[PDB]
């Protein structure tokens, strides 16, 4: 029954399918995220 063959309605569903990790860690934001501090003791 199924085949794949204004903005659309499914724009939120499609980009959720095409990504697996949702938090913006790729940015190198230069702003510091609250409550979770990446630290490594030397």
């Amino acid at each position: 029954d199924e085949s794949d063959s204004n903005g659309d309605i499914n724009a939120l569903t499609k980009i959720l399918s095409t990504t697996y990790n949702y938090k913006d860690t790729l940015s190198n934001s230069k702003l510091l995220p609250p409550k979770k501090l990446d630290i490594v003791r030397l």
Binding site: K30, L31, P34, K35
Partner: protein, 49 residues
């Protein structure tokens, strides 16, 4: 102006946002009963800002 000196405008330019902590929405249940959806959404936005 230096390239790192541009980014200190980008650091200082942000403003404080009130966070979402674990006890911030647990009082909303006492006013679900027969309220319109418009006047509930402002009662979420009044907590977040």
């Amino acid at each position: 102006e230096d390239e790192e000196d541009i980014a200190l405008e980008f650091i200082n330019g942000e403003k404080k946002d009130k966070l979402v902590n674990m006890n911030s929405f647990t009082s909303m249940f006492d006013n679900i009963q027969n309220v319109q959806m418009d006047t509930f959404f402002d009662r979420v936005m009044k907590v977040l800002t």
